[model samples]
Target chain A: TATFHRCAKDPWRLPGTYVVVLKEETHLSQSERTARRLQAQAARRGYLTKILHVFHGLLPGFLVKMSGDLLELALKLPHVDYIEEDSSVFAQ
Target chain B: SIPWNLERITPPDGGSLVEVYLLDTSIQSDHREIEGRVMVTDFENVPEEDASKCDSHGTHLAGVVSGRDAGVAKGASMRSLRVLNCQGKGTVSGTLIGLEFIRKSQLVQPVGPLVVLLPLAGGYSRVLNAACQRLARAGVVLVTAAGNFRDDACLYSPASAPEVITVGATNAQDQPVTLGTLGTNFGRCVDLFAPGEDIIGASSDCSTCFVSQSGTSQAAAHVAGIAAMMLSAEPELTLAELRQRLIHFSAKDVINEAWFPEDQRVLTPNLVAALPP
Candidate 1:
């Protein structure tokens, strides 16, 4: 299991955008419940977030223009998982 | 049709509807060859208009897949998404957004078998990989270009992603291309190869339009069209099952080392072999 970092590529780092993945055990039973709770927590920090996925034991989270050092804060939160930058993808 | 003759089979005419999502450039929906089959679904609401070669890539790809006269699978329908920009490029976000839209559609209703044709290939994106896997798990047959880079396919994105049918290019003589990026990428990542050389298909210029071009892009489109034909024949086939069906029906006797691994044959998708069991 490779740990998710702030994205290995610097070119993809956004000023505030980051993708967060929640812990597998957190949503052991109800993914929707976990997703709503995570959304509320992100909203409280004034972070714009979109729940890209929240089922099947993987929490695919999206953050847009987060205002502060919220990523560090997110790591400390209960049932939270890893954080990585929203790496840029290209079309060839 | 060379595809029919070479494959030793003829696909039925328009029995069932197969939805092919062409996630590439803006398509000229009114192309005379394609007619009402091309449907546009633009992610950028009020998207800016452009008509460069990049903008018409989707049109050409769609025409190869299901054009009335030139297509490999003439019975399939097409859904074009202008995910890329004027330079024939698309960001990870735009690509994911398009996939998300597809995922969202099935969440609401029973959208029968889907074939997501990604004519574009870029560097690997884990997020995109995860999304594609999810879509495949949800039963979307994913097809993508192995890229013309002539390098290891793993270096590319969605093409290198597992469970995706990654396609490489072959020439008019059913030979692998050696020049430019039109050459095939080798490795375990690549799944198949298709004719991609100086082939002509519909362009986005006008109602009556066509152009000759070459790339793994066209190769992938051919495979996607074949996937559409397979799904139309057996709508219940999963991505894994479809891959198996393709492999089972593909010609294995005539081997060509031009593509990769020295053991794999020059790629061709056979409709006769793809017929449902």
Candidate 2:
């Protein structure tokens, strides 16, 4: 994540927050000691049963849906601060 | 001991060991486990004890669990610790007694990533509880059965233990079984899911067949297998990190108010591809 000024070379805003990710954040190496994580499991077929990856991919975006009921949500906070953008080239 | 029909419950000889977690098994056999080797059933071509109790239910149940994905870990080794001795009946005390061998084995080396699959969800003594707690603190993953009571009693001890990863059963349709227990606080505790309905797996004679089984016992096996696979995939995943991954990378996820508030439906633990998060 980066910050810059519009029309001026000098950047005003600074890096806001630092997000510490777990596995994906660090190296993709598994050649070392790994923390043996635990889980509580159930066997339902729907996640495997119902939806597809396409839906999983589209889900996060659905949260920002501008439809009737969902539209009421996006307005809860300042729209400017909450930005949702994809990894598109700056040239666009 | 009252003899069981044996054929009905014994898993077909897949020759895989059940996970001998810090918890206990009701069967009286030695088997190998996912991460560490315990006094449970040792992994061998032959069964040390009569698998008569399990027949193929354990294998069938295990198959539904880690069997084939509806999406889960595939390469985990298993050992059926014939804890229940019989397919359908088991007491928490008997469960504990069956796994005493593991507690005894820990004297030699610490119990690593092992999980005990017990159904009915209760009966943990102070001594057993303390041992399980210590095991959880040491990076061992304890998976327990949430039972088929189907209400909300899945939060029982050992299963309810802070160290344990309690599991509930679901159907082939990916829906929590009509009889699956519930009323668990997902954020603070509870982990993930696996196949618990009419599942299929190896059985006596090592044939490639599957069966229909149910209960949290099977769910525990699937959860344990997933944990083992994550460990195997990224051998460097620290136990804590692996546990974290279980929570994060869990295939079926829900959109609860605490974690994912946007979608307020009981979502499945399904994740397709890794997006740029």
Candidate 3:
């Protein structure tokens, strides 16, 4: 059995969406390569993940839509720093 | 009613050369108060047919920041980043994407003296806070609303991020706006208070129409405008310098403490935002 990080509870979390942040990369190209590798690996494992946006500058992360099981697998993948449930923000 | 709120501060030259990016809903770019000074950039991909249904929230915020009559930085250029939708709601992913776009834009072409106004709030998200911190580190002045939850401002994202200037709300009498259970979010996370209640600004209803609103969103706009003005005067000010200047120049220990919840009164700063002469 593989140990994986547990997802935290959030009241405003949007269902089926998660932001996967990768560990620090020295260059934007490295970050993109790592993200694509992760996505490809996930696809090869039969997890159909949809990439929303691949952040390169401010945050080296990717917004993805996938199943709960896929999220668990992504957390356990190499170069995966941490993941946050995408939630609704509003005009105050 | 007259704009006594704006009158309280010494008016500086309009932040003519400054650029203010409002990360909110769509703005009615042609609204008289913000006409010719406002530009709309869509991130949510609102269908062209439904563009007219964009929320009024962004327009109101734009007016408060740079409206010819009701604004604080009348000469500042306004760019609306439509992160939210017609219902005034957006996702953290959407906001992050918007921030990334801004980061890239600034790096490609150094715009003169830029300030990003985030008149939005939600439950705490470390991801959002981290993004904001990075943006500030990159030399952008970021201001955000301290939420209206009447809870600890630390319980909200971006506001809780120390790098951004978080603003709370005050009524005309300089009292913190509190009504029964609902009021401005308080605590050390809030940098200062500003005139937020009963603020008048452009309305999306018509080109010439205006409306009144009350919230920390309005409060943050006032501070963003002031920041634009300060940046226009001194474009090279860093985030730390600007934050310090804003705190030092604001009216200190002036918000009515009687209205603050007993537990939060000690944690909340008593300062109200004001423009430097």
Candidate 4:
């Protein structure tokens, strides 16, 4: 879908690496029902997940690493707003 | 001697100190210009040698920002956050950690508003933008270099982030720096320009030496230095209010005709001047 490309700068994001930003409302604590829902949905897709960082304030989001193309799968899940390759950033 | 004429205005209120957090390579604090004023962030992962080398890039930037002779602000204090390595290269994670360190450090020492100078540029990262916004929201006036690629600043990360006061470069003639990034990124992406070409400032190789360097990095440092001075006097100025005054008080500037028609060209400000006496 057109939205998948918007998630990454390149047409094909580097295989097996992506950063997912869940919708602010769904950014619950690790022990909450919201976290369990997202965790179950992600595990069902056969993807490994590791949380880099999480944001609770303005533009609430998190940096996650997962295997395989989960842009479409992640977007279809609840509370997922944005996804992009852990895009390479250099000093400006 | 400083190339720009940003000398004292009101002598910075009593007990008010202008502090700038420079995110670049390590600095040689022994330099006469910086001396005891340089503070290093405690990043446990960085090697002692790599963290204290006082290499050229960061040292030079610190000098330009607050050197005794070449600096824009006379008595500004500088904190060194060694993000980039000796090769002057670093990734997003390195810088993100540096930003977090600066944010926490400022809260520890509430000595007036802090100015953050980022002399590096790279591709877009939503995480980086969120980090920068957090710093801005924390009241750290953030400044970054417009990329030297002479392209649209919106294409870059920290420069693209509206929360930062992105700076471009100009020459002694007050023209857009030909050697560095062009001023075409002069819209909302770039907030101001400063003397960046052939800028003479501190050198890291020796304790007492100086050199000439070019790029938007130097220009951003200039604004950071000046912004520190402004904040030193009016410590109550929020980042938003300060940005507005800097743009509004700057001398309305125009560029060369080679780039645009006279009527179509927009007037941009290169230097930051103090409010009228």
Chain B TM-scores, listed for every candidate in order, come to: 0.85, 0.61, 0.94, 0.85
> TM-score of the A chain in candidate 4?
0.58
Against the true structure, candidate 3 has what lDDT? Answer: 0.82
TM (chain A) per model: 0.55, 0.15, 0.73, 0.58
Checking candidate 3 for backbone clashes, the offending pairs are: none
Question: Tens digit of lDDT per residue, candidate 1, span A1-92?
Answer: 32455534465444455555555444434445645665688778766666553334223444344544655565654555566655444333
| Model 2 chain B worst lDDT window (10 residues) | B2-11
**What are the Cα lDDT values of the candidates?**
0.65, 0.36, 0.82, 0.65
What docking grade applies to model 2? incorrect
Better of 1 and 2 by DockQ: 1
- Report lDDT (Cα) of residue B3, candidate 3: 80
lDDT of 2 by residue, A15-70 (tens): 21111112222222220111111000101211111111010110111111111222
Scanning candidate 4 chain A in windows of ten residues, the lowest lDDT window is A4-13
lDDT of each residue in B1-277, candidate 3, tens digit only: 5686786555344898789988898878888889888877655522122254576899889999999888999889977788887877887788888888888877888879889999988788888998999899888889999998888999888799999999999888888876356878899999999888888888889888888889999999999999998888888888888888888888888777877779888889998888988
TM-score of each: 0.78, 0.49, 0.92, 0.78
The sequence of per-residue lDDT tens digits that candidate 4 reaches over residues B1-277 is: 3254343212122213767888887778888877766777665222122233437888888887777766777577778877776667665555666787676666666776788898887676675776798778767789998777666666676888889998877666666666533433444477877667788878876778888888888878878876876777777888888988777666554435344324334533344333323
Candidate 1 DockQ category? Answer: acceptable
- What's the lDDT for residue A51 in model 3? 75
lDDT of 3 at B207: 87
lDDT of 1 by residue, B137-210 (tens): 76788898877777777777788788788887766555565656347665667786666766678877776777
> Number of the top candidate by lDDT?
3
Q: Rank the candidates by DockQ, best first.
A: 3, 4, 1, 2
